[PDB]
From a paper:
HCAR2 is one such receptor, activated by endogenous β-hydroxybutyrate (3-HB) and butyrate, and is the target for Niacin. The receptor is highly expressed in adipocytes, immune cells, and epithelial cells, where it exerts its effects on lipolysis and cellular immunity via the Gi/o protein signaling pathway. Here, we present three high-resolution structures of HCAR2-Gi1 complexes bound to four different ligands, one potent synthetic agonist (MK-6892) bound alone, and the two structures bound to the allosteric agonist compound 9n in conjunction with either the endogenous ligand 3-HB or niacin. Our results demonstrate that the conformation of HCAR2 is stabilized by three pairs of disulfide bonds located at the extracellular loops, and this limits the size of the orthosteric pocket available for ligand recognition.
The structures of HCAR2-Gi1 complexes bound to 3-HB and compound 9n, Niacin and compound 9n, and MK-6892 alone were determined to nominal global resolutions of 2.60 Å, 2.55 Å, and 2.76 Å, respectively, by single-particle cryo-EM, respectively. Detailed examination of the structures revealed that the carboxyl group of both Niacin and 3-HB inserts into the bottom of the pocket, forming a strong electrostatic interaction with R1113.36 of the receptor. In addition to electrostatic interaction, the carboxyl group was further stabilized by additional hydrogen bonds with the Y2847.43 and S179ECL2. Unlike 3-HB, Niacin has no hydroxyl group but preserves a pyridinic nitrogen. Our docking analysis indicated that the pyridinic nitrogen of Niacin probably forms a hydrogen bond with Y872.64. Consistently, replacing Y872.64 with F872.64 to disrupt the interactions decreased the Niacin potency by more than 10-fold. However, compared to 3-HB, these residues form a more robust hydrophobic stacking interaction with the pyridine ring of Niacin, greatly enhancing the binding of Niacin to the receptor. The high-resolution structures revealed that compound 9n binds to a previously unidentified crevice between TM5-TM6-ECL2 on the extracellular side.Detailed analysis showed that compound 9n predominantly forms hydrophobic interactions with neighboring residues in this pocket. The phenoxy moiety of compound 9n inserts into a pocket formed by F1865.36, H1845.34, and L2586.62; the pyrazolopyrimidine moiety forms strong π-π interactions with F2556.59; and the isopropylphenyl moiety engages in extensive hydrophobic interactions with three hydrophobic residues on TM5, namely L1945.44, L1955.45, and F1985.48. In addition to these hydrophobic interactions, only one hydrogen bond is formed between the carbonyl group of compound 9n and the main chain of Q1875.37.
Residue numbers in the entry:
A (entry chain R): 8 to 302
B (entry chain S): 1 to 121, 135 to 247
C (entry chain A): 3 to 54, 182 to 354
D (entry chain B): 2 to 340
E (entry chain G): 5 to 62
Amino acid sequence: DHFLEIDKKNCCVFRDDFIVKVLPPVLGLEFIFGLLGNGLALWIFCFHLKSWKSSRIFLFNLAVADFLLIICLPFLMDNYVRRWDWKFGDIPCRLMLFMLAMNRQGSIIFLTVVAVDRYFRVVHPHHALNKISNRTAAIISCLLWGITIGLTVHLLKKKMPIQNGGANLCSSFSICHTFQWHEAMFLLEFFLPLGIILFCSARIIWSLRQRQMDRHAKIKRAITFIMVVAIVFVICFLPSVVVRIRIFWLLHTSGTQNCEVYRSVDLAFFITLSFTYMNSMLDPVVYYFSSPSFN
Amino acid sequence: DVQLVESGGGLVQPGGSRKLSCSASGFAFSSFGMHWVRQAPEKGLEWVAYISSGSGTIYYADTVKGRFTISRDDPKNTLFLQMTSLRSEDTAMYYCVRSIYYYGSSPFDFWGQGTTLTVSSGSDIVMTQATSSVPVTPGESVSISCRSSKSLLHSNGNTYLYWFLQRPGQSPQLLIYRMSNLASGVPDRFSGSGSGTAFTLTISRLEAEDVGVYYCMQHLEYPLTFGAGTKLEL
Amino acid sequence: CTLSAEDKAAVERSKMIDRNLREDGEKAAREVKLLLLGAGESGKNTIVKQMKTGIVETHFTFKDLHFKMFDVGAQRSERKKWIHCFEGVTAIIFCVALSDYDLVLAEDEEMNRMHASMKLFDSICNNKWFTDTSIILFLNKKDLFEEKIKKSPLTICYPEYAGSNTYEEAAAYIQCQFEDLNKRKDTKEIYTHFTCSTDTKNVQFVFDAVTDVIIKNNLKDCGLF
Amino acid sequence: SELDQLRQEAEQLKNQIRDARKACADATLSQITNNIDPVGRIQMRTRRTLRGHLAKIYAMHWGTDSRLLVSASQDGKLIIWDSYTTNKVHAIPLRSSWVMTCAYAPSGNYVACGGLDNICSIYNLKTREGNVRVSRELAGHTGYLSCCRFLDDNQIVTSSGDTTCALWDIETGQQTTTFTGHTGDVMSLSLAPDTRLFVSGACDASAKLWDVREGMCRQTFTGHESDINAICFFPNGNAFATGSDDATCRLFDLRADQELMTYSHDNIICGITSVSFSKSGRLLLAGYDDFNCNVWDALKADRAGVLAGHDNRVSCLGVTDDGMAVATGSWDSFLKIWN
Amino acid sequence: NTASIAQARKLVEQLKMEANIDRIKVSKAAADLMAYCEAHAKEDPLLTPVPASENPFR
Ligand SMILES: Cc1c(C(=O)N[C@H](C)COc2ccccc2)cnc2c(-c3ccc(C(C)C)cc3)cnn12
Ligand SMILES: CC(C)CCC[C@@H](C)[C@H]1CC[C@H]2[C@@H]3CC=C4C[C@@H](O)CC[C@]4(C)[C@H]3CC[C@]12C
Ligand SMILES: CC(C)CCC[C@@H](C)[C@H]1CC[C@H]2[C@@H]3CC=C4C[C@@H](O)CC[C@]4(C)[C@H]3CC[C@]12C
Ligand SMILES: *[C@@H]1O[C@H](CO)[C@@H](O)[C@H](O)[C@H]1NC(C)=O
Ligand SMILES: O=C(O)c1cccnc1
């Protein structure tokens, strides 16, 4: 019924009415508040902050990644309103999928970089990494962006759209039996920076309360917001990974035969994938507008 | 006191390789640019190579470019000139020249004693001196005129003319460093003037201590070109 | 571009000077600046020899961290004309003798050395240049104070003190009286240590306080403070 | 009691001085100057920005060639600047980094500096070795040395925080002349154009006119309400202006021995760090703690212009000897040239 | 405390010489400063800005 050969590989896709009913309003809210927050934050970084240190540069790159993920959401609603129908072509579809995966991964990468930065600020106070110049942060950010580009440009050599039954399909996340680097990147870009972020955050909290430094109110605020950014990362990137792992379990168990069982996990995967963009919505609020030094 | 001592010279066959060393004592060698200036037995000063402080900028004369190598080692205050493929026209007495460059500085102020090296058997600013050998009575004023093909007056107001006196059997010393600026340790009776391409050097009340060969050198644009040399006799 | 040979060489010299200035600034940025203060010759010298005429420079290294501790003793002038020079120090090491609670300063009639230390601490701690600068308060000569508190009560120094004439309670009372002079408790921290004439751990306490200050400055740089 | 009688005689002498000042004042500078044309709006632009200091710049001095500068900052570095090309001619590492004053010799051969080490260190710029070395260290002040000014290559007057100005012989390093009489710490210093007299502003809210060759105070000028931090002669040497912490600049005359005009505004409440005059003396430039320099009509007490552009407190000022530019130094580690 | 008498004598001697100082009228000094300002007004580059050809900091 739903069976579809995309790249000579068995499998099946879906076009649900619940997609049309749920995805466009959530993505509209995410696009509106993410655009406002990221634009205001980028304006403040560019003009309001007279000078910025290495830490700010990483936060600026995180804001750039969040903004570039936000600006490609209107095309996602343009895909979602008409029930997985793409009316732009091949190169815009490839650019949208590449920009989505790239800026989600780059947002995660710079969240992890900020977490490791704060870890070295607290746990190793006299380290030379806390005194790196703005140029060192510039080359570091450029190579992080380059790693993101190198891991993501495999989507720009995939033929798009899929056009199942006269409806053009622009999706980089298709439930298919064959092994894919994109799914492995989707799980890796959660699980390994999850470990890094949780380790760094736990070490920061334990080091701050081990020195009796938490008696200060600003240290309480820093502890609270480190907990907030860890929980935000977890609740924004965990559920889509859980649903993708369930999809993997179903593919290993049931396979790509009698695809009526994959509808619920596909729908739930897209609802839980909206939270990865809600992360870029919430990142200005929990990173820049929560900072006392930020204007 | 400030001293520059050369070593490594001697008789070498053509096509050979010799290295000249310039041991510096009495001054901060790291903060000075260093020049090599050779004088052939025909009595003409010729600039060879220049290395800046910190070895950041290196220049060579067009006749030794790609054939000579100038280097310095600031820990031991030694200046080197690695020379390969020596020809018969490389037979000259090489002087190690000390020079510093800031606002109001006096480069080419101190010259080394010089080592003697013997080899057996277009766009440069051409500078000419009309008089090569004139007699002068001591106690009377004398003028040495120098000319340049290009105007040495830069847009910053500095006219880059350098006057050197080389006594017989003695290293050259700086007298005037920018067309009027009297150097240190040289008496007040030496005065330089001029404008553009025409230049003169006035020595009022000459004595036997002023007997020697006078060279005019530009420092406007590399390579640095010396004059033919004006010798005052009697 | 439109430069002579001497102009280009002077620009190169200026760039070398800029390079050496950057290296010196990076070397000085990793150093810890400490301002040493106290009311007269009370406990500064013992503290100085424990880690190690205008301003005195004391240099010591502890746990791969270089410390620059400045003694402004014998600078008998108006403090406000030069105390802004030490605005960017990491912390202020304030040395207070515990045994001079009953001694007189002898410069003013009926003047207490202890109250002079309180007034100097009140001026330094609540100064406009030290709003966010932490103070490592050292309470010098605890053993002498312990052995002389039996002979002389602390009530001759603090009339409102009603506690027992023991070392621990009166020492805690003196520490509380010094910490009460901080009117900026929401933005600075006071570290108090009791040091004997020959106490080994004084440097470790300074290192811990400086490390806390450096953590606060690091969180300030990353926007968490 | 002889002490009470001498206090009464001093009070009588002070009343006589005040009465002689009051009887000699008939028409103020405003009452005569209000009938001439104002200077309009004086707008200056930052022509050069001298970067390279990494701590708060505490002092500066211009060369007599009106091109070479010297600046002091808490880095422990005396940087000599080519202001025309923004080039560092010299960088002098200091033994004491707590420098609060610097001077440049009129011949250009020497640079002095001093600070919390109570020592004026003379630096020989033009050495045979090609480096800047300490000529000698002048010691003898018991307080922080707040200002120094070269008379020639061998004479220098140093202000200090021991309530004492001092004239030194650099050939011998000895205390040639000691100027005493100030009650508070002497914070500023200014030499007359003929170097016959000099004025000093101290923390006793007073300015004193000294004579170099007799070493004793001629006149004492009062009127300020706080610590005088800046002082500068009028270009003819017959008047001077002060700057203090009460946000007022006062102009004093040597012959009239009076205060002529107060340069204050209601919107200015912060102290004054530096005071300098233009070449004609028509413009008075004062550096304040509210991060900018205010140009004052020195004859009319009108704000002729504001030199804004420093992110921290403007600590030092200097006008070149040809009057071409004014240079402002500040605590944000920058020097700016204005025209 | 007998050393304060010498300080008081020095202070009253300084005040006595400072009182015996010939003073010109403040109108005359004001006119002198005004005349000096007017005589050198044209040669003041800060008060009267020079053209950019004559400005070394152009
Ligand atoms: C199956 C699979 C795929 C895959 O190619 N799925 C296709 C849609 C095809 O689906 C099929 C059908 C049949 C048989 C197998 C797969 C990708 N990545 C992974 C992972 C992984 C887990 C953790 C990490 C990090 C340490 C954090 C990385 C990777 C684990 N399994 N896995
Ligand atoms: C010198 C200091 C101030 C650093 C200046 C900020 C620089 C280093 C940072 C801030 C914003 C960053 C850029 C943001 C956007 C992109 C687009 C991306 O697809 C490639 C990297 C690139 C081009 C980044 C390169 C590095 C970057 C330019
Ligand atoms: C502290 C600053 C100065 C340097 C930061 C170094 C660390 C945090 C950077 C450098 C390389 C980065 C990693 C590069 C590769 C990946 C795999 C990707 O699929 C998820 C992110 C992840 C795991 C990045 C996490 C952040 C990272 C580890
Ligand atoms: C998919 O199924 C077809 C038909 O059974 C088979 O020929 C093909 O090899 C399978 N390919 C995959 C994706 O394993
Ligand atoms: O890569 C993505 O975020 C993506 C892929 C398909 C559909 N919506 C989003």
